[PDB]
CSV table of C-alpha atoms in Angstrom, one decimal:
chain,number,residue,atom,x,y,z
A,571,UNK,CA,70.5,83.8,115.3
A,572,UNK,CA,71.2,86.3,117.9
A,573,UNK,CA,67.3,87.2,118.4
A,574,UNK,CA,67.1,83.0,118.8
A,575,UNK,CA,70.1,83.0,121.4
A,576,UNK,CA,68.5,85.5,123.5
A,577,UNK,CA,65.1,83.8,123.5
A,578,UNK,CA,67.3,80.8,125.2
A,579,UNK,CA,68.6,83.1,127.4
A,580,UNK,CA,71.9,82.2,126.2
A,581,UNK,CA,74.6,85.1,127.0
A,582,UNK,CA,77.9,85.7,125.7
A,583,UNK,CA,76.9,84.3,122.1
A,584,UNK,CA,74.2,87.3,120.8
A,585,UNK,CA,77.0,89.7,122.2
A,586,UNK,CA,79.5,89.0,119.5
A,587,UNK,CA,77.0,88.0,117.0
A,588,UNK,CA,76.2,91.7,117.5
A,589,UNK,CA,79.3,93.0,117.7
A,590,UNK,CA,79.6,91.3,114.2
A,591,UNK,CA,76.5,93.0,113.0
A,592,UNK,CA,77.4,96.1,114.4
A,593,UNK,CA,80.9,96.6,112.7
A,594,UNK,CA,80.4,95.2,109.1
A,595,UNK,CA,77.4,97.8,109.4
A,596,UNK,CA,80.0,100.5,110.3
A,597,UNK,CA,81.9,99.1,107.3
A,598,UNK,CA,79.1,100.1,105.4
A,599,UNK,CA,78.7,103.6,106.2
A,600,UNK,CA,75.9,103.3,108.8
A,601,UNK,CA,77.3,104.7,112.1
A,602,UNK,CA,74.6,105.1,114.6
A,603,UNK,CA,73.4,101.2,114.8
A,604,UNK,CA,77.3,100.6,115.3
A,605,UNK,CA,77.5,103.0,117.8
A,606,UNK,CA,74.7,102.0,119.8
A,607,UNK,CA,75.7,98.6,119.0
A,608,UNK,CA,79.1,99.1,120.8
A,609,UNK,CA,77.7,100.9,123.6
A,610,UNK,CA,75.4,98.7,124.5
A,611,UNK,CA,78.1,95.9,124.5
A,612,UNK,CA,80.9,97.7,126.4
A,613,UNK,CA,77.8,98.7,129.7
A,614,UNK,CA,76.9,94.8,129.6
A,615,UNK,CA,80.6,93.9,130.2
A,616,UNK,CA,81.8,96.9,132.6
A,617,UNK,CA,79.7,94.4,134.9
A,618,UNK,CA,81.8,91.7,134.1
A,619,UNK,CA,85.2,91.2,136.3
A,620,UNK,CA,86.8,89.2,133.1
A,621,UNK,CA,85.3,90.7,130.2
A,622,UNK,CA,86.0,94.3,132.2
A,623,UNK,CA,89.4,94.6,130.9
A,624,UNK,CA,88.6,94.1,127.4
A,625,UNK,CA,85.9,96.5,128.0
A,626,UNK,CA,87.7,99.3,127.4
A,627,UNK,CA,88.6,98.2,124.2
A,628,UNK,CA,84.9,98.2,122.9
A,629,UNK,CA,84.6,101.6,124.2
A,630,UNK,CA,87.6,103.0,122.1
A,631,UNK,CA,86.1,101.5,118.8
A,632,UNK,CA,82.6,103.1,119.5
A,633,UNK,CA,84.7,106.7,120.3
A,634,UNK,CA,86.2,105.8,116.9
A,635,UNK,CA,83.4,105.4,115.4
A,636,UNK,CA,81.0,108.5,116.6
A,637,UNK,CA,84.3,110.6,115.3
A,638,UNK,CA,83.2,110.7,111.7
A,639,UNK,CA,80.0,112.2,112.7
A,640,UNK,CA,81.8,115.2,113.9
A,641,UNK,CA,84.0,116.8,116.1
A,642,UNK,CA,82.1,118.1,119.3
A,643,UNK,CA,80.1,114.9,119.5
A,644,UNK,CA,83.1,113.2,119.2
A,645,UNK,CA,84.8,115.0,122.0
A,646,UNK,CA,82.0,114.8,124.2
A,647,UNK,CA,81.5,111.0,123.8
A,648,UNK,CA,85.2,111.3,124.8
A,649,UNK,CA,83.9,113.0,128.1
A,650,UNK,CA,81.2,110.8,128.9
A,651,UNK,CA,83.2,107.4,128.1
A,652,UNK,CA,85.9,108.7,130.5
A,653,UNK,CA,83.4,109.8,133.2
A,654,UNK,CA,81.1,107.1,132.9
A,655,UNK,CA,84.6,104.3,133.3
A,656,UNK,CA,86.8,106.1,134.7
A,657,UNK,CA,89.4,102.9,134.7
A,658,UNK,CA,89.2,103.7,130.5
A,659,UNK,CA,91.0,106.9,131.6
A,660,UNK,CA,94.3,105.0,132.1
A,661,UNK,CA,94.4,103.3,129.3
A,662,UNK,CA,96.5,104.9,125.8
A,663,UNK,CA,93.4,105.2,124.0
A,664,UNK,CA,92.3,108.4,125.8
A,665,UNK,CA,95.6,110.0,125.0
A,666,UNK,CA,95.4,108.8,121.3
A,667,UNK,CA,92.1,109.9,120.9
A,668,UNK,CA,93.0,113.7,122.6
A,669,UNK,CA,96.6,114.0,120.3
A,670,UNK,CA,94.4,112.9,117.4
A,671,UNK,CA,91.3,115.8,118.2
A,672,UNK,CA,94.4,118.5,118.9
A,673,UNK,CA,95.8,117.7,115.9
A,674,UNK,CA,92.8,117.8,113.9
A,675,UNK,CA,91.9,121.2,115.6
A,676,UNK,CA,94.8,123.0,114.0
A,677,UNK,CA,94.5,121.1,110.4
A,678,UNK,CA,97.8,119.7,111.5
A,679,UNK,CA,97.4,116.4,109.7
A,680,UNK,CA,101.4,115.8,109.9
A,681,UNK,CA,101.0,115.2,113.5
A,682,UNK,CA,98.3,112.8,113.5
A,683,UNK,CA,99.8,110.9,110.9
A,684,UNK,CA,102.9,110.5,112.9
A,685,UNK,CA,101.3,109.5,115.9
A,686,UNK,CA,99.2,106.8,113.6
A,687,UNK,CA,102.8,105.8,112.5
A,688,UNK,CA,104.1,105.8,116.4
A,689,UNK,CA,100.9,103.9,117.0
A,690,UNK,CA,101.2,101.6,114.7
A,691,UNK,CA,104.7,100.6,115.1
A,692,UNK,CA,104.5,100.1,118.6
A,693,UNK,CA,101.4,97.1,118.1
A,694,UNK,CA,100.4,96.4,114.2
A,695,UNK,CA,97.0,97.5,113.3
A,696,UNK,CA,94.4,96.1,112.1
A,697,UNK,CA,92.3,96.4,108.1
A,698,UNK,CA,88.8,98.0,110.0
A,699,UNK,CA,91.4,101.0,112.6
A,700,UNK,CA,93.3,101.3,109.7
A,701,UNK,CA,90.1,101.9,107.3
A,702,UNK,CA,88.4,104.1,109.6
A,703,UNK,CA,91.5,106.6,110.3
A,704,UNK,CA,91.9,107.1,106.7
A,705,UNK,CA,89.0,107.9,106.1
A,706,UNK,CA,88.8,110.3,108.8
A,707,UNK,CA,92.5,112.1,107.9
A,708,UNK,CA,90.5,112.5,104.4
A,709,UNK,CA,88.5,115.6,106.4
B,775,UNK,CA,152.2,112.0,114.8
B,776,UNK,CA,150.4,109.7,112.3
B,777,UNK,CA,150.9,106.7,115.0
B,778,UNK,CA,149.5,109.5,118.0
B,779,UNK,CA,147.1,109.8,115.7
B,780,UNK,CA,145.5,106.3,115.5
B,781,UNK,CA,146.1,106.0,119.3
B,782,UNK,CA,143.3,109.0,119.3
B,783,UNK,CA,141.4,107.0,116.6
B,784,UNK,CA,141.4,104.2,119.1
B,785,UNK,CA,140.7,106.5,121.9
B,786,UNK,CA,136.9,107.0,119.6
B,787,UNK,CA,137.0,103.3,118.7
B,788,UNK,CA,136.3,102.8,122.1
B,789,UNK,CA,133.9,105.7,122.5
B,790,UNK,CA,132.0,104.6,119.6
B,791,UNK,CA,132.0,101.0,121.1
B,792,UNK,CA,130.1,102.6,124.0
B,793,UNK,CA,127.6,104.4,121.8
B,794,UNK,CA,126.9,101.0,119.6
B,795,UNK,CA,126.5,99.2,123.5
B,796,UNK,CA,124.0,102.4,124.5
B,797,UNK,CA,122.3,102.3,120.6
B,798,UNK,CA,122.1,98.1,121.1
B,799,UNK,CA,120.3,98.8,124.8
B,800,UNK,CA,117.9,101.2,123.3
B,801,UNK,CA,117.1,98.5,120.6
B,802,UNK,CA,116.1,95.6,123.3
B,803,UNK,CA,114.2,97.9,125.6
B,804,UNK,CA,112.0,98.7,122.5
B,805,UNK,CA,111.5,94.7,122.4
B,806,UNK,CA,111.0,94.3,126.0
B,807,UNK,CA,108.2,96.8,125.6
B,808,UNK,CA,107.0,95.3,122.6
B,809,UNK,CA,106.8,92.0,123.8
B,810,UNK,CA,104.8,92.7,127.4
B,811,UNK,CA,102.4,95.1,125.5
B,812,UNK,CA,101.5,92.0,122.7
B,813,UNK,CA,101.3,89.5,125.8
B,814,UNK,CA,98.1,91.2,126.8
């Protein structure tokens, strides 16, 4: 369907078809077509005044997701995303992101899970987040 | 004493009544910031 959308040059409906695609893959344990997936997404809508905002967003879930792979690449995804939109710099994700990667550097597992908690109480969160940081605080 | 004593009881009645005030504050700032950050 998407591949038929974009033959009609019809934007705005492939994207989240995609974006679909992309994170039930995720879901099932395949990271790099989600990551690429989300990339490509969040640098078709940096463009975008309206969708700009919930840009960001996008690019958190792709950090997210290249975090399982490991650790360096995850902290220099973190470097690029940041350098690439700096406005993404402002935004809480960065500083979740860098509490979660400190704690994880010392094996201190008691202060990501609190910050999680913190996190959490502050906006509810959702079955895929909550799926993907567990799995991670299994490391 | 016992009634000087309940005048001081009273004395952190009323201090305590400021700390429940200060406690209740704390309380609807967290919903304030709740609030404008689900708005979003």
């Amino acid at each position: 369907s998407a591949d038929y959308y974009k033959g009609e040059e019809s934007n705005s409906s492939a994207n989240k078809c995609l974006l679909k695609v992309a994170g039930y893959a995720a879901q099932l344990e395949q990271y790099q077509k989600a990551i690429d997936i989300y990339e490509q997404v969040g640098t078709s809508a940096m463009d975008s005044p309206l969708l700009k905002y919930s840009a960001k967003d996008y690019f958190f879930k792709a950090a997210l997701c290249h975090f399982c792979i490991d650790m360096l690449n995850a902290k220099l995804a973190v470097q690029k995303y940041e350098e690439l939109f700096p406005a993404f710099s402002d935004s809480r994700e960065c500083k979740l992101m860098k509490k979660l990667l400190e704690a994880h550097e010392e094996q201190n597992v008691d202060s990501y899970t609190e910050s999680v908690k913190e996190y959490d109480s502050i906006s509810r969160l959702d079955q895929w987040l909550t799926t993907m940081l567990l799995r991670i605080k299994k490391t | 004493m016992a009634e000087d004593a309940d005048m001081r009881n009273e004395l952190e009645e009323m201090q305590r009544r400021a700390d429940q005030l200060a406690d209740e504050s704390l309380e609807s700032t967290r919903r304030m910031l709740q609030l404008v950050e689900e708005s979003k």
